[PDB]
């Protein structure tokens, strides 16, 4: 067997399943040899008979039986993929010519789900043999693999090469339940936005494991729909420009050189940087007011101040020490590193706001951890254990890490304070991300999408990317949440407006309710 | 962006 992929519940994810397939014999030279016919006698009374299971037109199967003298016949995509109880039920009417082969596929109990993490295995005609594609399929092709127990290596994961045979199961840090919510969540927000890209994980706050992760567009891994259009793994291979997010780690920057002092009035409005009027989202600015206010507010004048105060190339190693611009040695393949842009003023500047720097959204939960464990960032890890099932042998258990330590405890209570404002605050532009019963907090993340290949930023109505980095309960979280939206092609207005809290608060309010997280007011 | 309402 291949091995199974299990979540943390022990709940299977792929498994291998005995399935059947439909030949017919239909050539008179079968029964040249003996008594009972051994190829199709009655056309007509078979072709009926078997109208009763699948892709029943009599006529249809009629043609199929009827053509050319080939020996024996198959019925496309609808002649395979059968059930042990279609099978029996066939087997029963002993039709002359009639039999079902058996045949091994990978079966994918839950269809579209986690489709992107998970991955497909593709199947070699001839021999029947399943090869990981994408995701943990493919990475962990050689475990899984029951056959190839020649020297077993872990695809881009350089170690763990351990050298009748049943495979490896793999355990994943996924939990069904909260999956669900995501999955759900999700398809809302296709209804309604339609965006070209859209992905959202749920994180333990205090682990680094990965509860729930999905994107849009994703395929089918059962079907095989859609596989291969986007090829790429949003969470762990694909770079985004971040926007507002990233800002929260200007902050934590500053607060700790002591430059960020909330009650400090500073200049919002404009700032001309290399003949370019860098301005506030409201382009006119609010004239002086607070820093806390500004970054409530999401100021893009704020950071680009905080960033003169601090200094260029401290600013640097800042977001370098936050993990940025390197890969989170993370489990999955081909791990996207992304890139710090400091190439000029203008980067350097428009960096601290989240344009020209790329990052991976895991990246950013390595950062975003720092805040709720005392200025440590957690090694966001999804593969719980890889193990053989009959031996129990762990191959590889996974366990939380400490990634870096960039900043203080008391830097990351003062950086709290402000992403608690951000959404519960009197001015806030977020109260659209509050949640009923629930203390919640983060940041609000409107960037502007660059141009899929060469030129500048994407133009349009409203071409930006939305995301909020949210956690709860505040504090003293339970969870991280990050959602991202690139590009809605239906009512982009609401997008700008809303952001992707239309899925963030089911999410989020589904998630603490399942984990029994006490509640306030209804 | 930011905010926007």
Same mark, same amino acid.
């Given at each position: 067997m291949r091995g199974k992929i299990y979540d943390r519940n022990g709940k299977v994810l792929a498994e291998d399943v005995e399935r059947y397939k439909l030949v017919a014999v239909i050539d008179k030279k079968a029964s040249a040899n003996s008594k009972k016919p051994r190829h199709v006698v009655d056309k007509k009374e078979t072709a009926k008979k078997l109208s009763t299971v699948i892709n029943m037109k009599p006529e249809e199967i009629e043609k199929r039986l009827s053509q050319k003298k080939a020996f024996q016949i198959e019925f496309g995509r609808k002649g395979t993929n059968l059930t042990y109880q279609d099978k029996l039920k066939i087997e029963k009417m002993?039709? $002359? !010519? @009639?039999?079902?082969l058996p045949e091994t596929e990978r079966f994918y109990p839950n269809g579209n789900f986690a489709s992107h993490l998970i991955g497909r295995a593709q199947k070699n005609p001839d021999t029947g043999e399943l090869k990981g594609a994408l995701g943990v399929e493919k990475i962990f092709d050689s475990y899984?693999? &029951?056959? /190839?127990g020649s020297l077993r290596y872990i695809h881009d994961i350089w170690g763990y090469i351990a050298p009748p045979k049943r495979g490896?199961?793999?355990?994943?840090?996924?939990?069904?339940? @909260?999956?669900? %919510?995501?999955?759900? +969540?999700?398809? !809302?927000?296709?209804?309604?936005?339609? $965006? /070209?890209?859209? %992905?959202?994980?749920?994180?333990?706050? /205090?682990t680094g494991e990965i509860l729930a992760y999905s994107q849009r567009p994703t395929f089918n891994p059962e079907t095989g729909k859609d596989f291969g259009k986007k090829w790429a793994n949003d969470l762990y291979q694909n770079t985004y420009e $971040?926007?507002? *997010? %990233?800002?929260s780690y200007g902050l934590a920057a500053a607060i700790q050189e002591g430059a960020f002092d909330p009650d400090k009035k500073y200049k919002s409005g404009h700032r001309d940087i290399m003949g370019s009027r860098i301005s506030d989202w409201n382009r006119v600015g609010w004239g002086e007011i607070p820093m806390?206010? !500004?970054? *409530?507010?999401?100021?893009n004048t704020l950071m680009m101040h905080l960033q003169d105060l601090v200094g260029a190339d401290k600013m640097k190693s800042w977001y370098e020490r936050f993990g940025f611009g390197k890969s989170t040695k993370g489990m999955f393949d081909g791990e996207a590193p992304g890139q710090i842009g400091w190439s000029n003023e203008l980067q350097q500047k428009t960096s601290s706001f989240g344009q020209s720097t790329t990052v991976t959204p895991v990246q950013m939960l390595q950062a975003q951890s720092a805040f709720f464990n005392? &200025?440590?960032?957690l090694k966001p890890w999804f593969v719980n254990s890889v193990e053989n099932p009959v031996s129990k042998r762990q191959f590889?258990?996974?366990? /939380?890490? @400490? +990634? !870096?330590?960039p900043? *203080?405890?008391? *830097?990351?209570e003062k950086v709290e304070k402000q992403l608690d404002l951000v959404v519960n605050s009197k001015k806030s532009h977020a109260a659209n991300y509050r949640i009923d019963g629930y203390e919640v907090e983060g940041k609000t993340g409107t960037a502007q999408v660059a141009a899929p290949n060469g030129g500048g930023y994407v133009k349009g109505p409203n071409p930006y990317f939305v995301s909020f980095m949210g956690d709860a309960p505040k504090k003293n979280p339970k969870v991280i949440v990050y959602a991202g939206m690139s590009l809605a092609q239906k009512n982009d207005q609401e997008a700008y407006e809303l952001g992707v809290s239309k899925a963030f608060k089911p999410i989020m309010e589904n998630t603490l309710k399942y984990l029994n997280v006490g509640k306030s007011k209804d | 962006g930011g905010g926007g309402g």
């Open positions: 002993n039709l $002359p !010519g @009639i039999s079902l899984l693999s &029951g056959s /190839k490896d199961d793999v355990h994943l840090t996924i939990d069904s339940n @909260i999956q669900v %919510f995501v999955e759900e +969540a999700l398809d !809302g927000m296709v209804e309604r936005y339609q $965006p /070209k890209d859209l %992905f959202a994980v749920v994180m333990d706050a /205090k $971040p926007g507002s *997010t %990233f800002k806390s206010l !500004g970054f *409530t507010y999401s100021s005392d &200025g440590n960032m590889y258990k996974g366990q /939380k890490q @400490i +990634a !870096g330590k900043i *203080t405890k008391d *830097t990351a | -």
